[PDB]
């Protein structure tokens, strides 16, 4: 429950330390019960580094020191149904892993393949059909006659139905409308705080403000800084030189400070951007 890289590199085709592309220099140290980010601009390291953590790719210069297990470059295929019961990355539009004829058998596919009978995995396939946001109709049925928010709850329960130590998330409420992505994400504060190392691949700036505790930023194939929301968007040359952006709760102080208001700070959040339009218009 303390995930570090020192140091990881992955280029598809051979050679080291050459050259730069893909995932370069990749070094940090995370924490157990935190809300991690994988941010930046598209084309740097998020999807391309997400897939390493749980060994669905293995480095080419160093090591993935992780929750329990450990990924090396020479790694194999032994001891992966506890690893992949400790880490369960969630990819972009994961309502695409769907194949069963009951839902429950997709959410039973997480606990099974990881070691549980049908009738215990009926208590993870039912707990994760109920504690993931679906009603007395949809705590079991056919797995397609649903919507993509309800199938992204099969998608995100079938991958959560073992309670993994770690749950990475490649924008896993992507495509969802106002209310769908504002229920799956607070969900991930109750089951992050369970002691659970929540990572998040995205570019929603106004979600690191909202949901994060620390961050992890990249560019162009080289890690620019492992951070935490306030050491991040102070200098807006780090959003201009380094390709990134800010939240519209943070993007607006400068739209209000640039009138003479000069808000108290760079607050970045919505309930706390507006305590500063107050403590300064006094």
């Amino acid at each position: 429950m303390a995930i570090k890289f020192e140091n990881v590199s992955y280029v598809y085709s051979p050679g080291s330390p050459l050259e730069a592309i893909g995932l370069d220099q990749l070094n940090f140290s995370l924490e157990e019960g935190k809300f991690i980010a994988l941010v930046g601009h598209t084309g740097s390291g998020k999807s391309t580094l997400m897939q390493h953590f749980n060994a669905l790719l293995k480095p080419t210069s160093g090591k993935i020191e992780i929750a329990g297990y450990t990924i090396t470059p020479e790694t194999g295929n032994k001891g992966l149904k506890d690893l992949r019961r400790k880490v369960s990355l969630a990819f972009q539009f994961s309502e695409a892993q769907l194949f069963e004829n009951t839902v429950l058998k997709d959410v039973e596919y997480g606990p099974r393949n990881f070691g549980f009978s049908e009738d215990e995995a009926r208590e993870a396939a039912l707990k994760w059909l109920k504690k993931v946001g679906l009603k007395d109709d949809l705590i079991e049925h056919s797995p397609f006659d649903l919507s993509g928010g309800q199938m992204r709850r099969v998608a995100l329960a079938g991958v959560l139905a073992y309670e993994p130590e770690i749950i990475c998330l490649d924008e896993p409420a992507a495509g969802l409308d106002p209310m769908g992505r504002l229920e799956m994400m607070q969900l991930f504060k109750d089951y992050q705080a369970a002691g659970h190392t929540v990572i998040l691949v995205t570019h929603n700036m106004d979600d690191v403000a909202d949901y994060a505790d620390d961050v992890l930023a990249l560019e162009h194939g080289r890690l620019i800084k492992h951070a935490s929301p306030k050491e991040v968007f102070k200098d807006s040359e780090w959003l201009q030189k380094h390709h990134l952006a800010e939240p519209r709760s943070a993007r607006f102080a400068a739209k209000l400070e640039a009138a003479g208001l000069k808000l108290p700070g760079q607050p970045l959040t919505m309930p706390e951007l507006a305590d500063a339009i107050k403590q300064s218009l006094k």
């Binding site: 897939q51 749980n54 669905l56 992949r84 369960s88 990355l89 969630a90 990819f91 994961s94 695409a96 892993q97 769907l98 194949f99 997709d106 596919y109 997480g110 393949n113 079938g158 991958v159």
Partner: protein
């Protein structure tokens, strides 16, 4: 894409339609095999290009490596000096002399040349240009049950998706490792339901996406033949008379002993 390569910047090898007229001539040509102006010629006058591609010598073991019990296995059934089966004409089978060694080694050229002139089909051309030459000779099939303009959509579109598929056919295999998974596990009459997490979402994206691909085709102007102009075309240049003589010189350099 797709092996092998439009590598930069090799000699002509252009007009992906005239290297189809060529590659099939050079099999519809190297029929009628009797004499020496044919083999020593075709084996080097039909190779004078294939080499001119110059691409490294270790490529053709891709075309020969993992099955060698055809070539000097079944051409040896040709090694009877006279009609290597079911000879049948006339009266001597095996020889090591001026005439049983040629006929039976004379196929180590006339047959292993059309696998080179064909390699250098899938070697020099763009798979979106190997495709347009298949269709060039094609759509003039408007004599018969025509049906020709619906297969020339498919080809831009069959190939529009060989990457979109393999690029997602795959992510379903890595997305089905938050859930599982069982992939390599043998068993003849035991295990084959390894490929289920993947083929079950894959048939959606044949069947569903072809509904949501066909309704934006339809709802632009696709009333669909008749009408229907087109955009994907290429020109010929003064350059591309090279394979048009390649096969004309080899008309006379074919008969010039039969004369």
């Amino acid at each position: 894409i797709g092996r092998y390569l439009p590598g930069t910047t090799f000699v002509y090898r252009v007009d992906p339609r005239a290297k189809l007229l060529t590659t099939f001539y050079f099999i519809i040509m190297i029929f009628l095999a009797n004499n020496w102006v044919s083999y020593l010629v075709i084996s080097i006058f039909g190779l004078a290009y294939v080499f001119a591609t110059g691409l490294k010598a270790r490529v053709f073991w891709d075309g020969v490596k993992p099955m060698i019990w055809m070539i000097v296995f079944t051409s040896l059934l040709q090694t009877f000096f006279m009609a290597g089966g079911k000879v049948y004409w006339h009266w001597w089978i095996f020889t090591l002399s001026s005439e049983g060694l040629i006929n039976g080694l004379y196929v180590f050229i006339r047959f292993a040349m059309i696998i080179l002139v064909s390699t250098v089909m899938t070697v020099t051309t763009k798979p979106l240009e190997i495709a347009d030459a298949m269709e060039w000779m094609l759509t003039p099939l408007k004599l018969f049950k025509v049906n020709v303009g619906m297969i020339s959509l498919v080809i831009s579109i069959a190939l529009r998706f060989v990457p979109t598929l393999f690029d997602q056919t795959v992510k379903i295999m890595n997305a089905q490792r938050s859930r599982g998974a069982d992939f390599n596990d043998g068993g003849l009459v035991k295990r084959a339901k390894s490929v289920v997490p993947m083929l079950v979402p894959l048939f959606i994206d044949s069947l569903e996406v072809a509904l949501d691909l066909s309704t934006a085709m339809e709802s632009r102007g696709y009333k669909g033949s008749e009408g229907r102009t087109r955009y994907r075309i290429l020109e010929w240049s003064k350059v591309d008379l090279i394979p048009v003589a390649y096969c004309l010189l080899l008309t006379i350099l074919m008969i010039t002993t039969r004369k």
